C-alpha cells in the first residue's frame, strides 16, 4: 500500500563482534595491575532481555583469547623494573642439606657492588632449579635464557577482574543454570561488565573459581574427540589445604649498585615435606558427582576409570599452582585412582625457576616463614584416552579463563533500522 | 509503560521496541590506557557514523524519522501488521540485510532532491 521507508535510531539489534574490552577493579600492588583498571561501579546493572534467545559458544569466545594475552602482557610488564639474575648464572658448588636430598646447599663466587670485588656467598636451591656439569651445579635456565627475579613488593594474589564492553557494544550473560558450553541460551541478560574473574593460574584442578548451580556440569567441544579437554565444573566445593611447612629465611645478596638478589638463607627448625590435603569423603562424593554426568555421554553400563597423568612436562603432570608466593607441583596420583578423619595427601615439590606459557623465565623470591593456603577446587580438566578411562590434563592455560567466561559473549550494537510504514514527510 | 531498560525489548515486537528508543540512544556514547583510549576513540567513531548518515538523510535530531522513499516490495513483501506486531528488530535485520545498502542511497538523494527543491522555493 502507501508504504514508505522510515529511519529508526536506537533499535535493539546486535551482531557477533570482537572488540578490545577493558578491565575494572574495586579497591600494595599486584602483578595484575588492578589498581590501574578503572574503579568498578558499585551498581552493576543487569538488564533482563525477555523473550530473547542467543547462540553462545565458549570455545569460539574471544574474551578468553584476549584475557589470556592480557595476563601474559601483565606478566611481562610487571618484570621490567625488577632485578635481572644474569650474574647468578655462575658455577655453583653444591652439597645436600643434612638429614631426602631435595633442596641443595650451594656456594658460589658472586659480583659485589664494586665491580672488582668478589664475594663467596651461599644459598639454597631446590634441585628442580639446578643441574650438574659432570659437586658442581648450574642453574637450570642458564643454557636457555636469563631469568628476572620477581620484585618482592608485587603480589601474586588473584584479584577479581571485571571485563567491560566499550560504548556502542554490549556483553550478554547466559542465565541458563544447566548450560553446556555451546548452543542457544534461552535466558539472556545484558551486562556492562562481567562478574569478578580471579585470574587464578592453575593446572588440572581449577581453584577458587565459580561453582555451578543446580548440578555439576561438564563441557568440552567434540566430546567424542578424545583430544579435546573436558572442562568439568563442580556444584559444591571440595576443600583443599596446602602448606610448605619448612620455616625458611630470606637473605639479600648485594650483587650490584641497587641490584640485590634475595637468596634462600637456611631452614629454621624441622625439615618437612610440602603437601596438600583433601577430604577423602568430600572428594569421593564429588568424584561421584562427576562420574554421574560422565555416563550421560558415554553410557549407563560402561566403566569409568580414573588414572594419573600420561607424562610430559612437570607443569602438566602435577597440580601446579601458587600458594603464598611459591609455586607448588603436587602429585595428584592419589586423587585420580578410582574405577567406577579421611584426608588424602598429595606430595608437592617446589620450584623457583618457572618459565610459564613459553622464552623468558622468572625467579620467584623465597617467602619467609611457614606457608599454608586454603582453597576451593571448583573445576577440573580431564582427558579421555580412547572401558573408558579419564586422566587429568592442562595443555593450555586459557581453558582456565574459559571456565569463567563461558557465560559471556561480546556483541556490537547497530542501532540503525529501516522499516516500512504509511508515513511521508511534507513539501 | 514498563522501564525494560537497555535492550529491554530485544525479543519484543518491532512496534513495542519502537516506543523505547531513547533508552538505547543514551547508552550509545601506561600501556593499557592505549587499549582503553583505543576503545574510547572507536566509540565516538561508530557513533558519529550513525549521526553522519542521519545527517545526510534529513533525520538529524530524530529518533523516529519519516521519508519520501516508498517501500519496494522487492525488499520485503510482508504486510504492515505481520511486521510491527510479529517480527522482532533482530529478525527484521536479517530479512533486510541485503537491501540495507540500497535504501541508504535512496535516502541520501531523496534528501539532496529535497533541499534542492527547497532552495528553489526560497528563491522568490
Amino acid at each position, epitope marked *: 500500500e502507501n508504504l514508505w521507508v522510515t529511519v529508526y535510531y536506537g533499535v535493539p539489534v546486535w551482531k557477533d563482534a570482537e572488540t578490545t574490552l577493558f578491565c575494572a577493579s574495586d579497591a600494595k600492588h599486584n602483578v595484575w595491575a588492578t589498581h590501574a583498571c578503572v574503579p568498578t561501579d558499585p551498581n552493576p546493572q543487569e538488564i533482563h532481555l525477555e523473550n530473547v*534467545t542467543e547462540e553462545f559458544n565458549m570455545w569460539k569466545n574471544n574474551m578468553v583469547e584476549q584475557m589470556h594475552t592480557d595476563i601474559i602482557s601483565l606478566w611481562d610488564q610487571s618484570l621490567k623494573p625488577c632485578v635481572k639474575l644474569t650474574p647468578l648464572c655462575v658455577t655453583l658448588q653444591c652439597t645436600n642439606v643434612t638429614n631426602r636430598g631435595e633442596l641443595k646447599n650451594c656456594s658460589f663466587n658472586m659480583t659485589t657492588e664494586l665491580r672488582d670485588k668478589k664475594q663467596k656467598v651461599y644459598s639454597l636451591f631446590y634441585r628442580l632449579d639446578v643441574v650438574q656439569i659432570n659437586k658442581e651445579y648450574r642453574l637450570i635456565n642458564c643454557n636457555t635464557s636469563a631469568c628476572t627475579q620477581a620484585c618482592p613488593k608485587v603480589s601474586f594474589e588473584p584479584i577479581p577482574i571485571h571485563y567491560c564492553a566499550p560504548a556502542g557494544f554490549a556483553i550478554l550473560k547466559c542465565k541458563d543454570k544447566k548450560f553446556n558450553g555451546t548452543g542457544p541460551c*534461552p535466558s539472556v541478560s545484558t551486562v556492562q561488565c562481567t562478574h569478578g574473574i580471579k585470574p587464578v593460574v592453575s593446572t588440572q584442578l581449577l581453584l577458587n573459581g565459580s561453582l555451578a548451580e543446580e548440578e555439576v556440569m561438564i563441557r568440552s567441544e567434540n566430546i567424542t574427540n578424545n583430544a579435546k579437554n573436558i572442562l568439568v565444573q563442580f556444584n559444591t566445593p571440595v576443600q583443599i589445604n596446602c602448606t610448605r611447612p619448612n620455616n625458611m629465611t630470606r637473605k639479600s645478596i648485594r650483587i650490584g649498585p641497587g641490584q640485590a638478589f634475595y637468596a634462600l638463607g637456611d631452614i629454621i627448625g624441622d625439615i618437612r615435606q610440602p603437601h596438600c590435603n583433601v577430604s577423602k569423603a568430600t572428594w569421593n562424593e564429588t568424584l561421584g558427582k562427576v562420574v554421574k554426568q560422565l555416563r550421560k555421554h558415554f553410557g549407563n553400563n560402561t566403566i569409568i576409570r580414573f588414572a594419573n597423568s600420561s607424562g610430559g612436562d612437570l607443569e602438566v603432570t602435577t597440580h601446579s599452582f601458587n600458594c603464598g608466593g611459591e609455586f607448588f607441583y603436587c602429585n595428584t596420583s592419589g586423587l585420580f585412582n578410582s574405577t567406577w578423619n579421611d584426608s588424602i595427601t598429595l606430595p608437592c615439590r617446589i620450584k623457583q625457576i618457572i618459565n610459564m606459557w613459553q622464552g623468558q623465565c622468572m625467579y620467584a623470591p623465597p617467602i619467609q616463614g611457614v606457608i599454608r593456603c586454603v582453597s576451593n577446587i571448583t573445576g577440573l580438566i580431564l582427558t579421555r584416552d580412547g572401558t573408558e578411562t579419564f586422566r587429568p590434563g592442562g595443555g593450555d592455560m586459557r581453558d582456565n579463563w574459559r571456565s569463567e567466561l563461558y557465560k559471556y559473549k561480546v556483541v556490537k550494537i547497530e542501532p540503525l533500522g529501516v522499516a516500512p510504514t504509511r508515513c511521508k514527510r511534507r513539501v | 509503560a514498563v522501564f525494560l531498560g537497555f535492550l529491554g525489548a530485544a525479543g519484543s515486537t518491532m*512496534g513495542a521496541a519502537s516506543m523505547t528508543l531513547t533508552v538505547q540512544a543514551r547508552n550509545l556514547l601506561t600501556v593499557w590506557g592505549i587499549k582503553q583510549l583505543q576503545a574510547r576513540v572507536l566509540a565516538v567513531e561508530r557513533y558519529l557514523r550513525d549521526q553522519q548518515l542521519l545527517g545526510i538523510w534529513g533525520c538529524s535530531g530524530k529518533l523516529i524519522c519519516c521519508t519520501n522513499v516508498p517501500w519496494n516490495s522487492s525488499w520485503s513483501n510482508r504486510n504492515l501488521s505481520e511486521i510491527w*506486531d*510479529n517480527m522482532t528488530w533482530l529478525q527484521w535485520d536479517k530479512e533486510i540485510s541485503n537491501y540495507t545498502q540500497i535504501i541508504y542511497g535512496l535516502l541520501e538523494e531523496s534528501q539532496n532532491q529535497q533541499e534542492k527543491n527547497e532552495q528553489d522555493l526560497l528563491a522568490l
Partner: nanobody, 128 residues
Framework: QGQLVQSGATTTKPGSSVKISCKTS????????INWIRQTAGRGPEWMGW????????????????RVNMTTDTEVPVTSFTSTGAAYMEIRNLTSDDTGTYFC????????????????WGQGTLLT
C-alpha cells in the same frame, strides 16, 4: 511457518478420557497462542479455547470449561528464533456426541487485536 503435527486417531468409549498431542516446530513456540478447534458430526466447527505457552494463560468457551484439560510444555530452543514445543488436550465426560476431528492452531500475531486468531493449524485426529 512451521509444522504442528498431532497424535494418531485413537477411539475410546464414553465415560473415558482421551489425550491429544500437538508438537510444534519451525517457530518460537512461546510467541503464539495454541487454539483447539473441532468439527463434529452433529454440528459444525466449534472453538474450544486457547492457551498461551508464554503467559501460561488459559481462555476457553463456557461450553468446554468443565471438560477440557489443556496444558503445554516448555520450548526446547533450536536457534535464536526456532524452538520445539508441545500442547496437550484432554476431555472429561466423554460421549458419542464429541466424536469428531480435532486440531491445534497456533495464533496469528504477537500483538494487536487478532493476536490469538487460529492461523496455523495441525493435521486432524479422529476421536471415538
Amino acid at each position: 511457518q512451521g509444522q504442528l503435527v498431532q497424535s494418531g486417531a485413537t477411539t475410546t468409549k464414553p465415560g473415558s478420557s482421551v489425550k491429544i498431542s500437538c508438537k510444534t516446530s519451525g517457530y518460537r513456540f512461546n510467541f503464539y497462542h495454541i487454539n483447539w478447534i473441532r468439527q463434529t458430526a452433529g454440528r459444525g466447527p466449534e472453538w474450544m479455547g486457547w492457551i498461551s505457552p508464554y503467559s501460561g494463560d488459559k481462555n476457553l468457551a463456557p461450553a468446554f470449561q468443565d471438560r477440557v484439560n489443556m496444558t503445554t510444555d516448555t520450548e526446547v530452543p533450536v536457534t535464536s528464533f526456532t524452538s520445539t514445543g508441545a500442547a496437550y488436550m484432554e476431555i472429561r465426560n466423554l460421549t458419542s456426541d464429541d466424536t469428531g476431528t480435532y486440531f491445534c492452531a497456533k495464533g496469528l500475531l504477537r500483538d494487536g487485536s487478532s493476536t490469538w486468531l487460529p492461523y496455523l493449524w495441525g493435521q486432524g485426529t479422529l476421536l471415538t
